[PDB]
């Protein structure tokens, strides 16, 4: 469920109108932040529109969104080069 994933997301990082990455982190459940949903083109637009409708935090960070899209697939934990920037994002979001 796309909408359900958006609604549970901790923060969504976007390249405006182009790419959206939904990150999920919960102490005790996720040892590392988890990419739970991704999209490009129309699916990115859908994610961002749902996030706006449901007031889920969205941060514009074009290089991060692009890099996560290329490297961290839906369902995967982030890898080491993303630890700090994604911790930053979760802090801004929370």
UniProtKB/TrEMBL annotation:
Official protein name in the record: EscU
Entry keyword Isomerase: yes
Q: Per UniProt, what is one GO molecular function of this protein?
A: isomerase activity
UniProt similarity note: Belongs to the type III secretion exporter family.
Keywords (A to Z) from UniProt: Cell membrane, Dioxygenase, Isomerase, Membrane, Oxidoreductase, Transmembrane, Transmembrane helix
What cellular-component terms does GO give this entry?
Answer: plasma membrane
Report which part of the complete sequence is shown: 248 to 341 of 345
Give the taxonomic lineage as stored in the record. Bacteria, Pseudomonadati, Pseudomonadota, Gammaproteobacteria, Enterobacterales
Q: What main location does UniProt list?
A: membrane
Subcellular localization? Cell membrane
Q: Which organism is it from?
A: Escherichia coli
Q: Name one GO biological process term.
A: protein secretion
Has the keyword Isomerase been applied to this entry? yes
